[PDB]
Each structure stands twice: as structure tokens, then as C-alpha cells.
Amino acid sequence: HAGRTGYDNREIVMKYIHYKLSQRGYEWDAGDDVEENRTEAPEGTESEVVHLTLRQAGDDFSRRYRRDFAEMSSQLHLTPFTARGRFATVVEELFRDGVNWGRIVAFFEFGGVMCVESVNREMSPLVDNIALWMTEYLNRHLHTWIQDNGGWDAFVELYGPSMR
Ligand SMILES: CC1(C)CCN(c2ccc(C(=O)NS(=O)(=O)c3ccc(NC(C)(C)CSc4ccccc4)c([N+](=O)[O-])c3)cc2)CC1
């Protein structure tokens, strides 16, 4: 028993980060497996309603906070070795006491800022590694808080767009 959508932290971050990159027009090679994979068709109105909420809400939050996540980015510095180790330290502080919708969204936005940081210099591919770590930690901590407290749909119900 577990819904019938097929939610996946990996796919959620992939879609979110994708739009973040598309904004600039950088064809992110996320789906290296471009062999037309139409298993059960792309149609997924189920998890679709949640995607728009997370992607739209996430960006909405970051927009409300001009100086916080970006300002700190300067400390993150650029490097493929420390990048991985520096990422955890950032998400670790986000959820130090307890998790919440507002916190989840925050981390989500943070990951994108970092994934793009690499592209700023010359590490677009790094965007893939970022989404990977985000899915590990997200599910390592959030998935438990989200699933235990309803699930992905729980948030969409709370932040149900005007009518739709
Ligand atoms: C960069 C930071 C250091 C990250 C952590 N921060 C937070 C900021 C705001 C919240 C927060 O608002 N929590 S909430 O639980 O009170 C909430 C408020 C609003 C909304 N959704 C809107 C209004 C639809 C879009 S605007 C938005 C989205 C998420 C967070 C903040 C603003 C949701 N939600 O999507 O579930 C949840 C939590 C942490 C402070 C800045």
C-alpha cells in the first residue's frame, strides 16, 4: 500500500532543477538515456498537480528572500572535491531541529542555486551530481517526515492553488 502515483525524490528534483536550468536555455543532459522510454506513458496528472505546486511554491519562497541563500553561496566556493562535502553542511543547518513544508522548500531551492553555480564557471554536468545528493538527503530525512505525515499530496492539499 502506497498511493498509485509513483512519487520519486529523484524525479521531483530532476523536474524542479530542469526548469531552473531551462530558464537560461542550458540543455541539461539529465536523461542521458534518450532511447524513448514510454513505459506507462508520460501522462501523470496525479503527481503533476504536486509538481506545479513544488516548482511554483519553491521559486515563490526564494523570491521572498533576497538575502539569505544566495548571500551564503559566496562561502560555498567552487570546487568538485569540497562541493559534495559543502552541500551537506548547508542542508544540515536547514533542518537542525525539525522538518517542515517551509524547510523542505528552502532546501529544494538551495540545491538549485548550487547546481547552477557549477554552470556559472564550467561544471554544468555537476548539476546531475547535485540532484543526486538532494534526493539522498531529501529522502533520508524528509521522505520520512513527509510520508509519515501524509505524503507528497499532503503538501499540495495544504497549498492547493486558487481553486485548482
Ligand atoms: C534561505 C532560508 C534560510 C531557508 C529557510 N527559510 C524559510 C522561509 C519560509 C518558511 C515558510 O514560510 N514556511 S511555511 O510552512 O509557513 C509556508 C509558507 C508559504 C508556503 N507557500 C506559498 C505561499 C504558496 C508560496 S511562498 C513560500 C513557499 C515556501 C516557504 C516560504 C514561502 C508554504 N508551502 O509551500 O508549503 C509553506 C520556512 C523556512 C528562511 C530562508
* DSSP one-letter string for 66-103: SSSHHHHHHHH-S-HHHHHHHHHHHHHHHTSS---HHH
CATH number for the domain spanning 159: value is 1.10.437.10
Coil, strand, or helix at residue 136?
helix
- Any ligand 1 atom below 6 A from CB of 152: no
d(CA 42, CA 82): 37
**Which amino acid residue places its CA nearest to atom 16 of ligand 1?**
102
Total number of domains in the chain: 1
Q: Atom of ligand 1 at shortest distance to CA of 107?
A: 4
- Any ligand 1 atom below 6 A from CB of 64: yes
d(CA 131, CA 22): 15
Terminus-to-terminus CA distance in the chain, angstroms?
A: 27
Distance of CA 12 to the CA centre of its chain: 6
What residue numbers bound the domain in which 80 lies?
1-164
CB atoms within 10 A of CB 5: 16
- Any ligand 1 atom below 6 A from CB of 63: no
- Any ligand 1 atom below 6 A from CB of 71: no
**Which amino acid residue places its CA nearest to atom 15 of ligand 1?**
102
